[PDB]
Amino acid sequence: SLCTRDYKITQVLFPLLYTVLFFVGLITNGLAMRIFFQIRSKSNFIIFLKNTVISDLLMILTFPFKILSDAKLGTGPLRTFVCQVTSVIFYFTMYISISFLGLITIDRYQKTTRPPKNLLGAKILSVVIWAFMFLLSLPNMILTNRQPRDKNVKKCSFLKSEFGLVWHEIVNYICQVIFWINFLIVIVCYTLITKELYRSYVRTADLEDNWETLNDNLKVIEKADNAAQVKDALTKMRAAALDAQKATPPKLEDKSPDSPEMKDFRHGFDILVGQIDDALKLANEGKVKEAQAAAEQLKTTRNAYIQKYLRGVGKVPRKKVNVKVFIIIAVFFICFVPFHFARIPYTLSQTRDVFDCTAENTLFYVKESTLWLTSLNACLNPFIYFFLCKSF
Ligand SMILES: CSc1nc(N)c2ncn([C@@H]3O[C@H](COP(=O)(O)OP(=O)(O)O)[C@@H](O)[C@H]3O)c2n1
Numbered sequence: 001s002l003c004t005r006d007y008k009i010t011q012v013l014f015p016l017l018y019t020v021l022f023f024v025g026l027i028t029n030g031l032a033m034r035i036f037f038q039i040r041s042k043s044n045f046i047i048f049l050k051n052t053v054i055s056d057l058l059m060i061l062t063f064p065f066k067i068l069s070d071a072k073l074g075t076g077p078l079r080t081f082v083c084q085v086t087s088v089i090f091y092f093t094m095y096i097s098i099s100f101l102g103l104i105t106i107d108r109y110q111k112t113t114r115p116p117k118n119l120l121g122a123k124i125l126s127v128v129i130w131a132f133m134f135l136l137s138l139p140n141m142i143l144t145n146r147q148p149r150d151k152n153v154k155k156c157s158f159l160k161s162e163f164g165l166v167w168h169e170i171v172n173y174i175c176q177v178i179f180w181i182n183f184l185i186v187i188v189c190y191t192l193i194t195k196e197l198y199r200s201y202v203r204t205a206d207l208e209d210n211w212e213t214l215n216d217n218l219k220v221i222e223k224a225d226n227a228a229q230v231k232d233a234l235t236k237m238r239a240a241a242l243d244a245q246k247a248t249p250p251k252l253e254d255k256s257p258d259s260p261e262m263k264d265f266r267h268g269f270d271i272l273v274g275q276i277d278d279a280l281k282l283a284n285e286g287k288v289k290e291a292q293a294a295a296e297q298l299k300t301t302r303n304a305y306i307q308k309y310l311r312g313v314g315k316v317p318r319k320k321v322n323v324k325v326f327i328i329i330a331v332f333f334i335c336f337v338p339f340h341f342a343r344i345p346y347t348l349s350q351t352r353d354v355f356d357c358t359a360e361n362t363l364f365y366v367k368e369s370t371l372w373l374t375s376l377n378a379c380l381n382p383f384i385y386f387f388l389c390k391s392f
């Protein structure tokens with residue numbers, strides 16, 4: 001009552017910040033709807049991605065009501081409407097987005113491990129997420145039935161009934177659980193994909209160590225003047241080559257044993273081992289120069305091409321680098337983590353008259369600032385689909 005909140009910086013900074021996000025958001029999701037809704041829903045990912053684009057658009061359409069109500073220093077019918085309807089829509093569509101981001105992450109993680117009634121399952125799941133958030137949101141709209149007694153007081157908590165304040169606390173608790181379960185899912189999925197990347201790296205580095213062994217021992221043969229040194233190097237080269245021939249590099253992981261990719265990889269080593277074997281036979285006969293000339297045959301255009309090819313097959317592919325799961329984890333840390341940290345103390349100040357005026361106002365400014373970061377997601381989310389061959 002006696003407490004005053006300074007809205008002079010709020011009425012210039014936030015409507016200006018949200019106006020930018022409204023136009024940036026309309027053009028981003030407009031050029032996402034007209035593209036993604038043309039393509040068919042043949043996978044769960046695209047079903048989840050289509051739900052994400054419309055939940056983004058619903059929360060962007062919420063911004064004009066906010067911009068113009070926050071532009072006014074005092075309360076009014078529009079501020080009451082924001083409190084009761086449009087800002088409630090913002091929150092329930094925000095947790096719809098977080099739910100589908102958690103689902104997209106599970107989907108994308110399961111695709112990395114991978115060597116219709118599931119579309120139905122994804123569709124029913126999509127309906128259940130929307131209906132559930134709507135179920136929680138509806139009493140918040142209905143229990144914001146009180147009129148503002150002081151025209152200078154714009155806080156939604158003063159427009160609420162006793163059970164309205166109770167439900168507000170319950171809803172904000174459930175949403176904290178929805179956030180942290182989805183954040184945990186994203187953290188786990190990211191850690192498992194990152195472990196797989198590090199595992200793919202060591203298998204490539206082990207394989208490349210074999211090539212270094214073979215090429216280092218070839219240098220020894222060139223600078224040698226005796227059959228004992230040539231035989232030693234040739235033996236280590238044969239062992240490195242036969243070791244490398246037994247490997248299943250990340251590019252050959254999901255390939256059939258009788259597939260041409262698997263066959264060319266093994267045959268490439270048979271040609272190089274064969275050349276080492278011919279040079280080793282000569283080294284055993286004490287013919288140093290002849291064994292050096294035959295080992296030097298690995299430097300021919302043909303055998304250098306065979307090496308370059310086999311080494312290329314051993315490299316870590318794009319599949320192992322998941323930019324979609326990294327973007328989602330980046331989005332949770334930037335857009336959602338600060339708001340969810342700022343929320344509980346702010347909810348506590350709204351449901352009980354326990355904090356000092358300046359303490360309350362500080363909690364408001366922090367939640368208002370972090371809520372804006374949360375709104376970037378609606379303008380960021382289409383970039384999970386924007387970086388692929390379909391959009392060039
Ligand atoms: C599932 S729907 C949902 N989820 C939340 N986490 C919510 N947190 C707040 N709301 C509602 O959205 C409206 C605005 O609440 P706040 O943003 O807490 O109010 P102000 O800081 O005073 O602008 C109120 O009717 C709240 O009950 C929420 N609604």
Ligand SMILES: CC(C)CCC[C@@H](C)[C@H]1CC[C@H]2[C@@H]3CC=C4C[C@@H](O)CC[C@]4(C)[C@H]3CC[C@]12C
Pocket residue numbers: 041046047050051054123126127130131134
């Ligand atoms: C008042 C509130 C609860 C209204 C919610 C509207 C709901 C019913 C809407 C919003 C987003 C929609 C989804 C958008 C995209 C797809 C993918 C498509 O392959 C099948 C339908 C499906 C799965 C839609 C079904 C209906 C849907 C879940």
